[PDB]
């Protein structure tokens, strides 16, 4: 047999872990991304691209370190090591945030390899590849927020930096500038993620309490681990309970386990649409009726106008050192204050 | 008749009712029904509610110019504090509407009814003779509601610090809360986040795996009821690519090799999570805030170096000063 | 013409109507706030 | 406040068109049984 087939069979051998063709893209890209983050939160600075400190070497604890995005003066640069901005010099390349693009691109390729790994395993076992389809929700999220959005703004500077507090900063920046909570697609996302956790808890509890042979000296033994369950309980019991409490229940197990797949996945997809909308700075910030009524009448207050005042504050007090490359300097008689209202 | 009491007890405890109405349910319907009738009337047509006691009101009703997203049931006045304020303690109907009476009616009946829902759950599961523990899994959203509607107000000293019942009202409460207590860096809120993302994730995993393995399902049906043989066919093989990833992570962490630990773990994850954050919201009720770092990095010249924590402190300061009409002389405060 | 041999019927049962109508009417309540502005 | 004359038409069409679509399929498959 030809050399291709020998090679192909050896990639598909029975091992502790399957390598497969998808492994060839998966393992280097994933390992190098993961190591890149590990050496960055441990040695690499951010002192020349944000004026912040985020390294164990600089002295910081687990929550305040990050591998940080490049400057705004780099534009949409790919930041290659051999490219014409670091020109083959390692120290400059770590200092200029080139390690950020390293992680982002290698992690995208790791995600591609992983969905391909799910297909490959599904096809050699011969099951339907539904778990790969489920894994398109993370990919949607990832390519919309770490790649598509910064490619719409002005640089990679507004891309979300890899880090704990660095992502906590993303939340306030979105809350203040775009008013993300008022966007309907994010509303649909919050409902979907909470709905997924809701089905998780309810399923987990009501299968646990309706088992066949919870006493009786259970005389069933197999297991048959791939079934996961879904014969170790009586469906009829479950239905008959829920159909009395909430007044509706499932009666078909297949559609239950498809609804569980459907809900949190659709959630993330709607939010992924929402944030690719923000990339063009197409946001819903306000309702036009409330603004005209509030301009015509200032004895009008709602919880929504209130949100507008708070957002107005977030921006002006965070921006002068969140965005230091803009060189905002704001006197303390122009910064917003509640007691001036 | 058989003298109505005997008929009445059979009627209540019957499980041949289309909707079970237990002895918890007997308290539950009046309370929940009162709560919802008051809620929809108040949401549509409750006149603006003074909430800082200075005679400046806020409109939350729909006939006063809101839509679905900006409307709310506005909480009780700050003057009232934690006083119990039924309608017969007011002296007119218009002043009970001006001080934010109804909000208290709704939440008190809602908490009673939602507790009786848990009771009704436990009772029905006791009648069918099954392991009654659906109720302890529900005790997590219930614990959460106690924490957010009853306890954080008590801790701060007023029901004016409660969560509004409206869409943008919740967003306002969240933002102000982050401003005064720094919830993100509270480890318990982090456990909460982890729990609900992990719940969603395990829901998708479980669903996807199960619907790929099912083949055909059929159970015998009769013209009045159901059968007694539940047929089920599934796939019963898996490979060694879900043995290094699934097999030797789960057999090692579940502490069992048994399939019955799957569904035990599925419910344990988000329930523990929501308990933890429900506990955390209460500890900030007595003002035990989360970690915050200012000036954790200084150079040997004696100049301060900033870090991300300080940027979040700046944004928090920005929100927090905007929230304070009351005075510009405030040094160290709350409660 | 001569009948198409690939002619199959189309189904929709009651519970799908309930679910589907719920989704339509609910989606309207969410986006109507933004249409009216 | 200015509320759109066309916001109402969007609302109206958004509900009425899909609802009558699903309903017609349902009554069609009910006459398929009887």
């Amino acid at each position: 047999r030809g050399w291709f087939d020998i090679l192909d069979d050896w990639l598909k051998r029975d091992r502790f872990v399957f390598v497969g063709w998808s492994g060839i893209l998966l393992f280097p890209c994933a390992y190098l991304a993961l190591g890149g983050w590990l050496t960055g939160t441990t040695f690499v600075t951010s002192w020349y691209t944000h004026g912040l400190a985020s390294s164990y070497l600089e002295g910081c604890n687990f929550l305040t370190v990050a591998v940080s995005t490049p400057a705004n003066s780099m534009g949409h640069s790919l930041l290659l090591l051999w490219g014409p901005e670091a020109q083959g010099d390692f120290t400059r390349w770590c200092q200029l945030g080139g390690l950020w693009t390293f992680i982002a691109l290698h992690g995208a390729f790791g995600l591609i390899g992983f969905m391909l790994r799910q297909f490959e395993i599904a096809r050699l076992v011969g099951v339907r590849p539904y778990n790969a389809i489920a894994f398109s929700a993370p990919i949607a999220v990832f390519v919309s927020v770490f790649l598509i959005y910064p490619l719409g703004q002005s640089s990679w500077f507004f891309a979300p930096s890899f880090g704990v507090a660095a992502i906590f900063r993303f939340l306030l920046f979105f809350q203040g500038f775009h008013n993300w909570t008022l966007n309907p697609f994010h509303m649909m996302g919050v409902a979907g993620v909470l709905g997924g956790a809701l089905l998780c808890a309810i399923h987990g509890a009501t299968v646990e309490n309706t088992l066949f042979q919870d006493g009786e000296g259970a005389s069933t033994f197999r297991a048959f681990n791939p079934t996961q369950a879904e014969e170790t309980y009586s469906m009829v019991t479950a239905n008959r309970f829920w159909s009395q409490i909430f007044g509706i229940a499932f009666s078909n197990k297949r559609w239950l386990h498809f609804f569980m797949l459907f809900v949190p996945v659709t959630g993330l997809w709607m939010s992924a649409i929402g944030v690719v909308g923000l990339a063009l700075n197409l946001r819903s910030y306000d309702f036009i009726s409330q603004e005209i009524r509030a301009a015509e009448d200032p004895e009008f207050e709602t919880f929504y106008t209130k949100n507008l005042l708070l957002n107005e504050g977030i921006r002006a007090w965070m921006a002068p050192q969140d965005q230091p490359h803009e060189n905002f300097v704001f006197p303390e008689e122009v910064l917003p204050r509640g007691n001036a209202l | 008749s058989a003298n109505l009491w005997e008929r009445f007890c059979n009627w209540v405890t019957s499980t041949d009712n289309r909707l079970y109405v237990g002895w918890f349910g007997v308290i539950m319907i009046p309370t929940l029904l009162a709560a919802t009738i008051c809620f929809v009337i108040a949401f549509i047509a409750a006149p603006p509610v003074d909430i800082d006691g200075i005679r400046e009101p806020v409109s939350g009703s729909l006939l006063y110019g809101n839509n679905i997203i900006t409307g709310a049931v506005v909480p009780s006045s700050n003057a009232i504090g934690l006083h119990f304020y039924p309608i017969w303690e007011a002296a007119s109907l218009d002043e009970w509407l001006y001080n934010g009476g109804p909000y208290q009616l709704i939440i008190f009946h809602f908490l009673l009814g939602a507790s009786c829902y848990m009771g009704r759950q436990w009772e029905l599961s006791y009648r069918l003779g099954m392991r009654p523990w659906i109720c302890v899994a529900y005790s997590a959203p219930l614990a959460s509601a106690f924490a957010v509607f009853l306890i954080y107000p008590i801790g701060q000293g007023s029901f004016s610090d409660g969560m509004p019942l409206g869409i943008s009202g919740t967003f306002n409460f969240m933002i102000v809360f982050q401003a005064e207590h720094n919830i993100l860096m509270h480890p318990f809120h982090q456990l909460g986040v982890a729990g609900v993302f992990g719940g969603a994730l395990f829901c998708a995993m479980h669903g996807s795996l199960v619907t790929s393995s099912l083949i055909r399902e059929t159970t015998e049906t009769e013209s009045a009821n159901y059968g007694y043989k539940f047929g089920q066919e599934e796939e019963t093989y898996n490979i060694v690519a879900a043995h290094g990833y699934f097999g030797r992570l789960i057999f090692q962490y579940a502490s069992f090799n048994n399939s019955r630990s799957l569904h035990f773990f599925l419910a344990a994850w988000p329930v523990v999570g929501v308990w933890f954050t429900a506990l955390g919201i209460s500890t900030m009720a007595f003002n035990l805030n989360g970690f915050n770092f200012n000036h954790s990095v200084i150079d040997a010249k004696g100049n301060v170096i900033n870090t991300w924590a300080d940027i979040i402190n700046r944004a928090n300061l920005g929100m927090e000063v905007m929230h304070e009409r009351n005075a510009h002389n405030f040094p160290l405060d709350l409660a | 013409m001569e009948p198409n041999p690939n002619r199959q019927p189309v189904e929709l049962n009651r519970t799908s109507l309930y679910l589907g109508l719920l989704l339509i009417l609910v989606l309207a309540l969410l986006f109507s706030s933004y249409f009216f502005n | 406040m200015e509320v759109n004359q066309l916001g109402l038409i969007a609302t109206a069409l958004f509900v009425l068109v899909p609802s009558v679509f699903l309903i017609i399929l349902y009554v069609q498959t009910e006459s398929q049984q009887k």
């Binding site: 009666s251 | 289309r18 549509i44 729909l62 | 309540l29 009216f36 | 509320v3």
Partner: peptide, 28 residues
Amino acid sequence: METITYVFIFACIIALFFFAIFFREPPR
């Protein structure tokens, strides 16, 4: 204009609740 539309859509949800409880499809 707007508020009538809001309450009408609400009213038909709660009607749909009633229909799903007391008129479900008999599963045979």
